[PDB]
A paper describes a structure:
P5ΔV8 adopts a lysozyme superfamily fold consisting of an N-terminal lobe (NTL) and a C-terminal lobe (CTL) connected by a central helix. The two lobes create a substrate binding cleft containing the predicted catalytic residue Glu95. However, in LTs, there is only one acidic residue, typically a glutamic acid, in the vicinity of the substrate cleavage site. Φ6 P5 adopts a lysozyme superfamily fold and our structure of P5 bound to a tetrasaccharide substrate analog shows that the enzyme contains a single glutamate (Glu95) in its active site. Together, our structural data unambiguously identify Φ6 P5 as an LT.
The G2238T mutation corresponds to a V207F amino-acid substitution in the gene for the lysin protein P5, which locally degrades the cell wall, either to provide access to the inner bacterial membrane during infection or to release virus progeny by cell lysis. To understand the molecular basis of the thermostabilization of P5 by the V207F mutation we determined the crystal structures of P5ΔV8wt and P5ΔV8V207F at 1.4 Å resolution (we could not obtain crystals of P5wt or P5V207F). The larger phenylalanine side chain in P5ΔV8V207F neatly fills the cavity, with no significant changes in the protein. By filling an unoccupied hydrophobic cavity, the V207F substitution increases the buried hydrophobic surface area in the protein. This provides a likely explanation for the increased thermostability of the mutant, because the hydrophobic surface area that is buried within a folded protein contributes directly to its free energy of stabilization. Similarly, the melting temperatures of P5wt and P5V207F determined by DSC were 52.6°C and 58.3°C, respectively. These data indicate that the V207F mutation increases the melting temperature of P5 by between 5.7–7.6°C. Additionally, the heights and areas of the DSC curves were greater for the V207F mutants than for their wildtype counterparts. The V207F mutation did not affect the structure of the P5 active site, allowing the mutant enzyme to fully maintain its functional role as a lysin, which is essential in the viral lifecycle.
Residue numbers in the entry: 48 to 54, 60 to 220
Write the structure that this text describes.
């Protein structure tokens, strides 16, 4: 039973086709497959036989990208289709998730020298955007606070991981 959040069109992908595409793309672009396995179930509906993803409104597809974030990657030179087309596609959305991870990793490492970009930190960056993610890490307040309980839990873990020097 999916929890109702206060805030029509979906696409369904099978687990196997997601897994196959993740394995291929993650290897190609140098992003851990485990990051995709972490992110996809948080952002999308896990249903019998795979995942369903909303492709209407501001946030779309497996990565739940908005157009501005998607277009940012294109501006960097990433070969993606237009937001509205690619966000409804398996491969393009998986490339975008990974390209964004790579960009956010650079942003995190530039602001916090010597620290490790963990999966939960990467998800914070993915969801809030790098500027707002850095703001949450430093201030403890979300710029865009209307997120799911699972997301908020991930962000709290991310900040814990960020501040603490080691596992403990």
């Amino acid at each position: 039973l999916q929890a109702l959040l206060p805030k029509n069109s979906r696409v369904r992908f099978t687990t196997a086709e997601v897994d196959s595409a993740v394995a291929r793309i993650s290897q190609k672009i140098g992003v851990p497959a485990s990051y995709y396995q972490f992110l996809i179930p948080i952002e999308n509906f896990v249903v019998a036989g795979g995942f369903e993803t909303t492709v209407s409104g501001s946030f779309r597809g497996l990565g739940q990208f908005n157009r501005q974030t998607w277009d940012g990657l294109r501006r960097l030179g990433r070969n993606l289709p237009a937001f509205e087309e690619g966000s409804a596609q398996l491969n393009a959305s998986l490339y975008a998730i990974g390209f964004l991870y790579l960009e956010n990793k650079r942003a995190y490492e530039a602001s916090f020298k010597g620290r490790v970009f963990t999966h939960e930190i990467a998800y914070l960056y993915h969801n809030q955007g790098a500027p707002a993610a850095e703001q949450y890490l430093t201030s403890g307040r979300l710029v865009y606070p209307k997120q799911s309980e699972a997301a908020v839990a991930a962000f709290a873990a991310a900040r814990n991981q960020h501040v603490k020097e080691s596992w403990a």
